[PDB]
Design a protein around this ligand. Sequence first.
Ligand SMILES: COc1ccc(S(=O)(=O)N(CC(C)C)C[C@@H](O)[C@H](Cc2ccccc2)NC(=O)O[C@H]2CO[C@H]3OCC[C@H]32)cc1
Lengths: 99, 99
Amino acid sequence: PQITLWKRPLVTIKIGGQLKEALLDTGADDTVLEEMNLPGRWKPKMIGGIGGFIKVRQYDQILIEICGHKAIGTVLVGPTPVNVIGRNLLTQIGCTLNF
Amino acid sequence: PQITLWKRPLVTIKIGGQLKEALLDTGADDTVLEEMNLPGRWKPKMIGGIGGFIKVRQYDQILIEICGHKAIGTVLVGPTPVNVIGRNLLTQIGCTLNF
Ligand SMILES: COc1ccc(S(=O)(=O)N(CC(C)C)C[C@@H](O)[C@H](Cc2ccccc2)NC(=O)O[C@H]2CO[C@H]3OCC[C@H]32)cc1
């Protein structure tokens, strides 16, 4: 689809078999989801945003469907204020900015 | 133009008589710029993201040219690590997400 930006670009995602709402976030290099249970192994990592750095669990090679488009990539889980879909997955679903 | 998301979507902007690089950021409600000494009245604001909150100065009706497209709106100024063009201005230049 073509998504205008007068509202937050919130979409439905599926991860771990569960449905969630997430923000399509071109200013995010990485995908960061709120605390949740996900199967498989992870490694602790740190990520920085506008307000400082947080601890996250890094899950590699995770299946995630975004507004009907499948991606498989890295998902960070931790105390983010919002589920954000970053460029690592936006590229996989073929997302571009246009004006 | 069409901007792919392999790399950060940085574009050149003009604000306050200065040229700067800034992110086209669909995940940002508002536009947040690195510290700069703009003239005029402002009011304090707190904005939050990954890592917590930062204090910024809110300037209204600020002229900003984004990749050749003129805009005018609210700009927040503070200790952000990156210049961020948010939805309040992206709508004004006709920017959409497409996949
Ligand atoms: C009210 O107006 C606002 C405007 C902007 C923000 S925000 O900056 O915290 N954020 C919000 C996002 C985390 C929901 C926008 C995100 O795109 C924000 C923009 C940004 C901030 C600091 C350094 C680089 C990029 N991106 C972000 O936090 O991405 C995380 C996750 O991936 C990493 O790449 C960039 C930094 C890391 C908050 C409020």
